[PDB]
Amino acid sequence: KKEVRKVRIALASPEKIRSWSYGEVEKPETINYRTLKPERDGLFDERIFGPI
């Protein structure tokens, strides 16, 4: 409803960085080599980043 009139930039604390996060990426995997679906704890996991 309100209109953005200024933009501030500052340092991000760990707890603030975790406030942005929908989950911790725990694994280096991306997509399954066969199904091509995202892996469960990897960089494309829908359980944290959102549905495809």
Binding site: A12, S13, I17, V25, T30
Partner: protein, 210 residues
């Protein structure tokens, strides 16, 4: 030992010898000295910024131009954190953010072959090294090994941030091209700060000879 009949008369580390039936103490302090960003984070956590302000103000009333120029620049940094509310230890990272996936996509193009973003392999190299550090701390590994993973960890984080800045840039196998870091995403001609200024292709447009 002996319930109080014998006591050590010097500082040092102990080691109980069962063959000689003796207890030796080597002259060794319990000193606190650290490496890595853990050490810097603690030093940043212990800084009393208000005292450093008074400490530097009284240094720039010194006649020498050189040292009151060093205290002048050093005060600009100190005044910044004070007037902003930024805690100086925040410059050391404990949690590293991860960009949303669709901004660093992975999709198959024509011919079935996949095409992905460099940021993924940078994150992937960071997750690999961070996970190896975890299961090395749990295995109780010696310090030479731990120091190596911590070096490679710092070298993995700042490659995600600004690949190439320090050290040789990380590249994919089969190429010399540096992987695009988060800084290259913002800085430069193709960066996000030049994107809106330089204009765009637009819908609802046409072209013809006149």
């Amino acid at each position: 030992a002996d319930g109080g009949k014998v006591k050590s008369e010097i500082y040092g580390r102990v080691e109980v010898d069962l063959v000689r039936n003796v207890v030796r103490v080597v002259e060794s302090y319990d000193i606190d000295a650290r490496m890595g960003a853990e050490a810097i984070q603690e030093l940043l956590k212990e800084l009393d910024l208000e005292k450093l302000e008074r400490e530097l103000l009284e240094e720039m009333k010194h006649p020498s131009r050189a040292r009151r120029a060093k205290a002048r620049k050093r005060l600009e940094v100190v005044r910044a954190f004070l007037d902003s509310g930024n805690r100086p230890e925040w410059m050391i990272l404990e949690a590293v953010p991860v960009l949303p996936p669709d901004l660093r996509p992975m999709v198959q193009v024509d011919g079935g072959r996949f095409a992905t973003s460099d940021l993924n392999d940078l994150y992937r190299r960071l997750i690999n090294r961070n996970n190896r550090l975890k299961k090395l701390l749990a295995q109780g590994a010696p310090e030479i090994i731990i120091r190596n993973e911590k070096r490679m960890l710092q070298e993995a984080v700042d490659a995600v941030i600004d690949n190439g800045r320090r050290g040789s840039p990380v590249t994919n196998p089969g190429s010399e091209r540096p992987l695009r870091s988060l800084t290259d995403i913002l800085s430069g001609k193709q960066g996000r700060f030049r994107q809106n200024l330089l204009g765009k292709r637009v819908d609802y447009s046409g072209r013809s000879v006149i």
